[PDB]
From a paper:
[name] is an auto-inhibited [name] E3 ligase activated by dual phosphorylation of its [name]-like ([name]) domain and [name] by the PINK1 kinase. [name] is an autoinhibited RBR family E3 [name] ligase consisting of an N-terminal [name]-like ([name]) domain followed by four Zn2+ binding domains [name], RING1, in-between-RING (IBR), and RING2. Like other RBR-family E3 ligases, [name] binds to an E2, and [name] is transferred from E2 onto the catalytic C431 residue (on RING2) of [name] before ubiquitination of lysines on target substrates. Furthermore, C431 on RING2 is occluded by the [name] domain of [name], which inhibits [name] activity.
Phospho-[name] K211N (3C) formed a stable complex with untethered R0RBR Q347C (TEV), and RING2 (383-465) was removed from R0RBR Q347C (TEV). The fractions containing the complex of phospho-[name] K211N and R0RB (141-382) upon treatment with 3C protease followed by incubation with pUb-3Br showed co-elution of components of the ternary trans-complex (R0RB (141-382), pUbl-linker (1-140), and pUb) on SEC. The crystal structure of the ternary trans-complex of phospho-[name] (pUbl-linker (1-140)+R0RB (141-382)+pUb) was solved at 1.92 Å, which further confirmed trans-complex formation between [name] molecules. In the crystal structure, the pUbl domain from the donor molecule (phospho-[name] K211N (3C)) was bound to the basic patch of [name] on the acceptor molecule (untethered R0RBR (TEV)) in trans. The conformation observed in the trans-complex was similar to the phospho-[name] (1-382) structure with fused pUbl domain and untethered/truncated RING2 in a cis molecule. Interestingly, the linker connecting pUbl and [name] remained disordered in all the structures. The ternary trans-complex of phospho-[name] (1–140+141-382 + pUb) structure in this study was solved at a similar resolution and in the same space group as the previously solved structure of phospho-[name] (1-382) in complex with pUb. However, we did not see any density of the ACT region in the ternary trans-complex structure of phospho-[name] (1–140+141-382 + pUb). Interestingly, we observed that in the ternary trans-complex structure of phospho-[name], K48 of the pUbl domain occupied the same pocket that R104 of the ACT region occupied in the structure of phospho-[name]-pUb complex.
Residue numbers in the entry:
A (entry chain C): 1 to 69
B (entry chain B): 1 to 75
C (entry chain A): 145 to 352, 354 to 378
The structure:
């Protein structure tokens, strides 16, 4: 499935993930695109910060919803 | 966003607004377009008179929705 | 589940999603201190709080918004919440047709009466055309509980979106007309006009054409014919 990321209010970019995909995995893949440390990144969805250990399934992220990394 | 203001005759004016624009703010832009003094303007949505202090968001007025305009006459 | 009116592409009542942005920078970067417990928490502005995690913004106040859940939607593709509408999980029968359907609308009368959307559509299309909607200077053009329960006027008038587009626009037209009349105003009697006018109550002479908004007709508000001196007829 796809999740849209708004890195520091930048235009949303699609990221392909799985149900089993963790938040840190997404933090890594975004960190690579932006060439920054994944440790400085925080993922915000539905007025909550998503923790690294949580998966996409656990977060109840719907197809093509948006997070604010 | 785009909203519409219509008189009861059906005459239609288009405005570029934000949900945060006050009812007072909406009343202005109308003066810019049609030259109606704001004091003569009364705006209505779903049969409710809109109060100057309030915003479009206060009335949950959506993009492409219509406000109705009627005129106060001093005579 | 919550329900919204999606104006496009669904053009119908759909299940919705609740989301939240910072009230100052209008970005979904605000983390809530606590989750909402009631409708008022999400409906009344600035009611709940948190921290906008965008550094340049000292965001405090939370702004809740709603989206259609039937398809992908952008951050700013918002829909109006129809807070009276609920999933009929407990299979409550419609107060009008007695059948079980989902979703349903729940009136805010003491008895919290339940109506299906087909019957609500019906209730609405019947009352509008018969000029049986009620004007409340506080609420607007609305309808009460179909059972006639007191203090049951619908407060969120976007619920009348169930009328459908054309009938909705007629509803708004009729409501504005009624607003004028309840304020002691007059509708211009000239054919093709019908402009809403609010003269001073003392004035008998009402002139409708300065900025192009009027037809210029000067009329007597009592007989609705061209302005005349003395008594009508
Ligand atoms: Zn939709
Ligand atoms: Zn902010
Ligand atoms: Zn029914
Ligand atoms: Zn009732
Ligand atoms: Zn006229
Ligand atoms: Zn007369």
């Amino acid at each position: 499935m796809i999740v849209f990321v708004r890195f520091n209010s930048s235009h949303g970019f699609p990221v392909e993930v799985d149900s089993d995909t963790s938040i840190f995995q997404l933090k890594e893949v975004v960190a690579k695109r932006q060439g920054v440390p994944a440790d400085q990144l925080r993922v915000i969805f539905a007025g909550k910060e998503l923790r690294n250990d949580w998966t996409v399934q656990n977060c109840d992220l719907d197809q093509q919803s948006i997070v604010h990394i | 966003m785009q909203i519409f203001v219509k008189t009861l005759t059906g005459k239609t004016i288009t405005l570029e607004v934000e949900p945060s624009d006050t009812i007072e703010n909406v009343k202005a832009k109308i003066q810019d377009k049609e030259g109606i003094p704001p004091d003569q303007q009364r705006l209505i949505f779903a049969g409710k008179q809109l109060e100057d202090g309030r915003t479009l968001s206060d009335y949950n007025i959506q993009k492409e929705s219509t406000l109705h305009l009627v005129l106060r006459l001093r005579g | 589940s919550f329900y919204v009116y999606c104006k496009g592409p669904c053009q119908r009542v759909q299940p919705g999603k609740l989301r939240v942005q910072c009230s100052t920078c209008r970005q979904a970067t605000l983390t809530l201190t606590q989750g909402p417990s009631c409708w008022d928490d999400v409906l009344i502005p600035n009611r709940m709080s948190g921290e906008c995690q965008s550094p340049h913004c000292p965001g405090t106040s939370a702004e809740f918004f709603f989206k259609c859940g039937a398809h992908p939607t952008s951050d700013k593709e918002t829909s109006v919440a129809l807070h009276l509408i609920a999933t009929n999980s407990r299979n409550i029968t419609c107060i009008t047709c007695t059948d079980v359907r989902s979703p349903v609308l729940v009136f805010q009368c003491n008895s919290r009466h339940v109506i299906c959307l087909d019957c609500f559509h019906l209730y609405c299309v019947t009352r509008l055309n018969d000029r049986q909607f009620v004007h409340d200077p506080q609420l607007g053009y609305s309808l009460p509980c179909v059972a006639g329960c007191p203090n049951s006027l619908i407060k969120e008038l976007h619920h009348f979106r169930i009328l459908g587009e054309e009938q909705y626009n007629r509803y708004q037209q009729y409501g504005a007309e009624e607003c004028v009349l309840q304020m002691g105003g007059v509708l211009c009697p000239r054919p093709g006009c019908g402009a809403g006018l609010l003269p001073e109550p003392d004035c008998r002479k009402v002139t409708c054409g300065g900025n192009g908004l009027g037809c210029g007709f000067a009329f007597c508000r009592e007989c609705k014919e061209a302005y005349h001196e003395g008594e009508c007829s």
